[PDB]
Amino acid sequence: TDLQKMVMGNTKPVELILDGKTVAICCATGVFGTAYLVPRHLFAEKYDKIMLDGRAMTDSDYRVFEFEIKVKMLSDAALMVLHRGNKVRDITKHFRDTARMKKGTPVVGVVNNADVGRLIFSGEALTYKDIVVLMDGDTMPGLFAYKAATRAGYAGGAVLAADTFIVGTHSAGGNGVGYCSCVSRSMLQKMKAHVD
């Protein structure tokens, strides 16, 4: 699958720095231009600089757009757009609306961070959840669950599910099941023209 290739190549490691020391780790999945999908809860941490693929930047180097996602809310999938940078492959055409998973179907999470390096995890789909409450008392909308073995740091990694496609970015997990924030191709498309 050239797709598994494309996505793997767009996934870059992220690191938050505070007082010269690394204080957080996760992944970023390039979607087009210099736009990257990233866990929104990532910005809830205190930091001085953000390192994307070894490149250190400050808040004056990019913009972070959030997603309204209608339920009955802010999704955990934020889009980080660098003012300048090296282009990534445009894979928005691999997200969907024009379909939907189904309990059982194969699931593949793509990771690339500083804790474990490049890696892939597989599991089986479950269902789509409108809201999931985390163990810290927080909540997250539009999530797709799946049977998988995940760990801290996978957040932001791409999750794939005969034709293959991209569901969204990994956000949370636990006791054998993982959750990713879903992303529609149209929302990414509208976001592409907005950032031009």
């Binding site: 804790d115 999931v132 985390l134 801290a152 957040a155 949370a172 997990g173 636990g174």
Partner: peptide
């Protein structure tokens, strides 16, 4: 309940 999986230090 699941936990946010951003690796914190």
């Amino acid at each position: 309940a699941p936990a946010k999986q951003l690796l914190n230090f």
